[PDB]
Structure formats: C-alpha cells, structure tokens
C-alpha cells in the first residue's frame with residue numbers, strides 16, 4: 087500500500103513526506119527526522135531542482151543508482167527513497183533517507199591527537215569501506231575528514247559531496263587516468279593526521295601542496311620518469327634537485343612501529359606501488375580488528391549506463407523506475 091503523506095513547510099520549500107517520518111527539522115536541501123517504523127534518527131535529502139537541466143537529471147539518476155546499490159556497514163547506503171507522486175507525469179520530486187550520523191571525522195576529534203588503538207579502528211573502518219567501494223570499480227577521488235560520517239562510538243561511514251590537503255599528487259597535477267590508490271593517499275594523509283594531531287600536507291595552494299609532498303616522499307624516482315608521457319612535466323621533473331625520501335620514524339616520533347610501516351606503503355609517490363585497500367586490511371597493524379571472513383565485496387557496478395546522452399524525459403523515466411523498484415534494508 088502507498089503510505090499516507092503530509093504537507094509541511096520549513097523554508098521556501100513544500101516538503102511532502104510519509105507519516106513514518108516525524109519531528110522534522112531543517113539542517114542545511116536536507117532535513118533531519120525521526121523514523122517511527124524503524125526507531126532510528128534519519129536525515130532526509132530532498133533533491134534540489136531534480137530535472138532542471140540534463141545535468142541535473144543525470145546527477146539525480148546517478149546519485150540514486152549508486153546509493154541504491156550501496157550496502158555496507160562503513161558506506162552510506164539507503165534506508166528509503168520516496169516520492170509523493172502516484173505516476174510518472176506528476177513525478178517531479180525525489181527524497182532520499184539514510185540514518186543520521188552525528189558528526190564528521192573533523193569534529194569527533196580532528197582537533198587533538200588521538201590514540202593508536204583509536205586510529206587503528208578508525209582507519210580499519212575506512213579501509214573496510216574502501217575495499218567494498220573499490221571492488222565496485224569505483225574511486226572516491228575526494229576522500230577527506232569532512233567526508234567521513236562518525237557516530238558517538240567511532241562507527242565510520244564514507245560519503246561524497248582546505249580541501250586539496252588530502253588529494254593525491256597525480257590529481258593535483260591532473261594526469262587524466264588514475265586508479266583506486268588515489269584514495270589510499272587520502273587515507274595516509276588522514277591517518278598521519280590522526281597520529282600526530284597535525285595536518286601532514288598543510289598546502290596553501292596547488293604548488294605548495296605539491297612541494298610539501300616531495301619534501302617527505304622525495305622527488306620522482308628514475309623508474310617513475312618512464313611513466314610520465316607529458317614532455318611538459320617530464321622535463322620539469324628532471325630540472326629539480328633530487329630529494330631523498332625522508333625517514334618516517336623521525337617524522338612520526340613515538341608512533342606505533344607498525345603504523346609507521348603502513349604509512350610508508352600507503353604514501354608511495356608512485357600510485358602503481360601503493361598498497362591496495364584489500365592488502366592494507368591484512369597488514370599486521372590491524373590484527374586486532376581484521377576479520378578476513380567479514381570484509382565483503384560488492385557486485386560490479388555499471389558506470390557506463392549512467393554516462394549517456396538522453397533527453398530530460400528519458401532520465402525522468404529511468405529515475406522513476408528506480409524509486410518504484412527500491413526495496414528497503416532489513417533490521
């Protein structure tokens with residue numbers, strides 16, 4: 087049965103939602119509510135200008151199929167998706183519902199310096215999630231603290247939305263091809279922070295960001311020149327005064343012996359030579375939390391279906407069908 091909805095206004099917007107979701111408050115569009123069927127606190131996302139442009143419809147469609155497909159303890163799945171439209175022609179609004187996490191990794195504690203146990207469990211989770219994400223054939227490209235959802239009990243979720251502080255060098259530079267180890271770079275910069283209480287690469291701009299990265303990991307090795315296809319950059323890479331990669335022990339003073347070993351394997355300048363998210367799970371450092379029998383993989387996800395040239399109406403139909411097809415999780 088199609089449940090019973092209601093009309094409500096909060097700011098400039100007519101939010102129509104099922105009775106199931108109660109005590110609705112706005113939070114920056116997005117409102118937080120109480121689900122009565124489940125007994126959880128939720129955040130509802132009402133989708134902004136759903137079919138304004140081709141680019142909007144395309145974005146809306148993409149967002150859904152992703153999170154609809156997303157089912158992992160450490161990645162943001164969906165609890166529901168609804169629409170107050172009993173047919174396609176009247177369909178013009180999308181609302182998406184997931185469990186509300188209290189804060190992000192910035193303000194759980196990115197202020198002060200945390201304990202090794204605490205960073206083990208934290209990193210273990212992100213890595214547990216990256217594994218899933220990456221097995222879907224998907225690269226986050228924008229991993230950072232303000233993109234990790236944490237509850238009061240350090241139970242971490244990955245979602246999407248100075249920023250460049252956590253980006254991999256090959257993204258700063260903009261090599262148009264890259265692989266999943268760009269996110270590993272993010273984890274290293276995230277981890278390194280959580281261990282020293284200070285930002286690893288406090289870049290003030292693109293170059294400063296780049297120049298601080300080499301200060302640690304050294305200049306490019308002779309084996310990395312062979313991969314640079316751009317003469318533009320290739321000749322510049324030469325002109326530098328070769329840098330020895332710094333000794334991580336003296337960068338992470340008093341830190342866990344194994345956490346130091348991890349940060350070396352992760353913050354490899356050459357991506358090809360960085361650790362896979364799956365490999366990083368098996369690393370000694372996570373012996374505590376690492377359950378090799380509970381680090382699942384996704385199905386492969388079709389990123390080709392989502393990258394097409396179809397009309398406004400043609401996305402609207404494709405997107406609608408998704409909402410009809412959605413079946414909520416268990417609990």
Ligand SMILES: Cc1ccc(-n2nc(C(C)(C)C)cc2NC(=O)Nc2nc(CCOCc3ccccc3)cs2)cc1
Nearest residue numbers: 116129130131145148149156182183184244245246247
């Ligand atoms: C164009 C596109 C690119 C990337 C993604 N994308 N990729 C991922 C993974 C890579 C799978 C992590 C996750 C997303 N999607 C999001 O992070 N969506 C979010 N939206 C908000 C706004 C309000 O928060 C409440 C709320 C309520 C209900 C649902 C979600 C959030 C915060 S997090 C989606 C679309």
Ligand SMILES: CCCCCCCCO[C@@H]1O[C@H](CO)[C@@H](O)[C@H](O)[C@H]1O
Nearest residue numbers: 255256263264265313355356357358
């Ligand atoms: C000053 C120059 C900094 C070097 C940054 C490049 C290091 C990234 O490494 C490179 O990643 C690319 C895609 O991920 C691939 O083309 C290469 O195979 C890989 O070696």
